[PDB]
Amino acid sequence: MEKHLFNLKFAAKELSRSAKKCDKEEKAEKAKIEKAIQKGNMEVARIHAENAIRQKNQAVNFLRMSARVDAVAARVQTAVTMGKVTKSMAGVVKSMDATLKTMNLEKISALMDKFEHQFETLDVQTQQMEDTMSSTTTLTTPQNQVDMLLQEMADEAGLD
Template sequence: MMSWFKKPTLEDQLFDLKFTSKQLLNFSKKCEKEEKAAKAQLKKSIQAGNMDCSRVYAENAIRKKNEALNYMRMSSRIDAVAARVQTAVTTQSVTASMRNVVSGMSAAMKSMNLEKVSNLMDQFEKEFESLDVQSQVMEGTMSNTTSLNAPSNEVDSLMRETADEAGIELDLNLPSGVTSTIGAPSATVPAEEQDLSDRLARLRQS
């Protein structure tokens, strides 16, 4: 019997938040359709020259447009709150006051009291100001430890070290990188050998 009246967990309330966010988004889409319908009626009414009805249809279209925007904003805000609750659960940083606010929000959403939900979200966001700072620190740490790009100076150093071990002269400023290998014929002639070659050439000419 007691299990029937079990107090909802934070995970249960997190589910309620996500469900309500989707429900409000559906309400927004419904209002958008009604806005389009009112605009179509407005067009027909204007073409018929009925200005009184046209004004009513125009008011309906504007009202539905505003309702759609309000539902969408509320859905987005609740979705953001749900993401913060998920972060709090994951990092085990949920406080008692946060639980109370979420519990009250869950009850208000069931009655679709959006004004009360909005007020509770204001309170909830204040509770999460410190958590936001903690999340930013955690995200920064994770970003540093999971970075796929190694520092370029370390890459260059390793490349040069490996080239030295392989007996390869490496110039990272050149497109190919490799300039010569140890034991391979040199592309440049030493100065002494060049001087000797010049002397032999002059002797042959004389």
Template sequence: MMNIFSRKNKLEDELFNMKFTAKTLLRNAKKCEKNQVAQKAKLKKVIEQGNMEGAKIYAQNVIREKNQALSYLQMASRMDAVAARVQTAISMGQLKANMSGVVKGMDTVMESMNVEKISQTMDQFEKHFEDMDVRSAYMEGAMSSGTSLSTPADQVDDLIQMVADENGLKIAGQLDSAGLVGTESPNYEG
């Protein structure tokens, strides 16, 4: 009997951790959105100064922050979905416990209940939690490596043009002369 309660507590602990993680992911998404706004303001400032190389750097930062915020939101959504499934599993476990109390005197109903199958299902569920922890660690690693990759040049140029248009700034021809940012080392010849 003690084993059933420890499994229930483990599920409730997992549920709490999942909800906490989802809230943390949402906070991280909001932080990225705030950083995106700050980087966009810096982008506007360097466009006003005519610094197109700096503009490309800030545009890459804006796009990276936006993509990272979306990744955090997506992970939070997935975590909420799994938490809902865990909540359902906890509720079903409580329902099964209540049902066994109600039908305790009914031998025929108790004989039809397959305790081994219930135990196997719970073991599988615990294994899924372990697998989910591995997947979560993998997603975190993939997300951190994905945000460090280069941002496509067309997205950078489009964002610079959009910010310039929103603020009535003229940048005609300046983007082409700015060159690529973050792909080559500066060449200093003396």
């Protein structure tokens, strides 16, 4: 499908370029007319005048085609990108669906209260551990000593 989009854009830019040439030729042809009629030739001056004119109207005609073809090119662009979005969206709806069948909310919620209970047990493990761990080395940290220390750095705390 892309192939046709690319050919349309190509045809558009094509028409623009050709129109551009015909216009350029038009200007050059004015110049050439002036050189011609400078001699006093009334025939060459004629067919040059003529080719100048046709170059200009061709410029109009081509450039018009460039317009309309460009427009269809735009809408085709929209059509393709729309296509991509549609496909990909179908993709997420499906994968998410078949992953919504085994992930259906009940199993999740269960997994979550299971979660609460779980790390709750983590916390009690922690607490227990730190009780025995702090009652084994506790000879090296009297309560009294810590009291007088904390007081020591209390009264003078911000005095430096």
